[PDB]
Design a protein around this ligand. Structure first.
Ligand SMILES: Cn1ncc2c(Nc3ccccc3Cl)ncnc21
Length: 317
């Protein structure tokens, strides 16, 4: 019969704010359904004076919100916002030191794979299609990386605390990147079967699993033919700002100025730790918040990133 009310804003995207007047006697839950304040689940909290004028996230439960959510995130996955908020609640508590002019993450909750991915993303040319991802990437480049990390988690369907794979993370993120112009032309040659050429576009044009060396891919790599015998696969043409070469972790020597950055993986599928090696004026090894320099580097490398623009082979088949 006596009611206290505050004004708050609800949103799915943090750009379109929708005015609400809420009753302080009931929970946010009772009023909006699942509600979050800066990542924290406030579904079962009651509105408080300090809340007046703040923005709360809600799940998209009307047509306007569904459209906004889709336009912002480019996903219709009903669990997405929940998982993002959940992740954000953890990532907002992590530390993001500047290390050698790059935003890193101090180790917490098995986040070594995310630190490595975050560092990599700052050194290759990539534009994301979902406004959420692109906005968050710009802020992460500027030093505020908590949202970006939470979004990477939500898009890769990974929970805070779980061991992650960098190659898999890059692959999922790449699905949301504009890589439509990227083109790869391959040739596979059999002394018996002949020469078979393949054109790839998009994510598949910038990724390779089986060798770390971009040079080796240009020169030719041995693979089975349908004939049963050994054929040569080699890169004919590449049009992309970068390429990613991956392989199961093995001892490998990184030579200064022959690549942009690399992932080191110590461990197996059940446990392990990533470190990031970048080529600048010398070799930097970024391990979360820790930085070491060296002229040479030899370690279990699993991904290497190289710069590219437009490459044509000099091989005449
Ligand atoms: C021997 N081994 N252990 C892991 C692994 C791998 N993927 C992976 C999975 C989880 C975390 C990190 C990575 Cl690199 N790919 C190839 N060989 C691998």
């Amino acid at each position: 019969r006596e009611v206290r009310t505050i004004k708050v804003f609800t949103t799915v995207d943090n750009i379109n704010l929708h005015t609400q007047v809420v009753d302080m006697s009931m929970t946010y839950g009772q009023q909006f359904g699942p509600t979050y304040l800066d990542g924290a689940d406030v579904t079962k909290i009651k509105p408080h004076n300090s809340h007046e004028g703040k923005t709360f996230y809600v799940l998209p439960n009307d047509d306007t919100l569904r459209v906004e959510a889709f336009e912002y995130y480019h996903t219709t996955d009903p669990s997405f916002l929940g998982r993002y908020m959940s992740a954000l609640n953890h990532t907002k508590k992590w530390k993001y030191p500047q290390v050698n002019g790059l935003t890193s993450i101090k180790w917490a909750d098995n986040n070594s794979y995310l630190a490595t991915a975050l560092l990599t993303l700052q050194q290759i040319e990539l534009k994301f299609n979902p406004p959420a991802l692109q906005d968050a990437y710009y802020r992460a480049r500027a030093g505020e990386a908590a949202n970006f990390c939470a979004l990477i988690l939500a898009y890769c369907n990974k929970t805070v605390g779980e061991l992650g794979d960098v190659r898999e993370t890059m692959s999922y993120l790449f699905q949301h990147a504009n890589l439509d112009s990227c083109k790869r032309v391959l040739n596979v040659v059999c002394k018996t079967c002949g020469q078979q050429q393949t054109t790839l576009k998009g994510v598949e044009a910038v990724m390779y699993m089986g060798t770390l060396s971009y040079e080796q891919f240009k020169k030719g790599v041995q693979i089975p033919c349908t004939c049963g015998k050994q054929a040569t696969k080699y890169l004919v043409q590449q049009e992309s700002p970068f390429v990613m070469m991956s392989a199961p972790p093995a001892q490998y020597e990184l030579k200064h100025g022959t690549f942009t950055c690399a992932s080191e993986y110590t461990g197996n599928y059940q446990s392990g730790h990533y470190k990031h090696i970048t080529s600048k004026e010398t070799l930097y090894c970024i391990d979360g918040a820790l930085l070491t320099k060296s002229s040479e580097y030899k370690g279990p490398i699993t991904d290497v990133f190289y710069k590219e623009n437009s490459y044509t082979t000099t091989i005449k088949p």
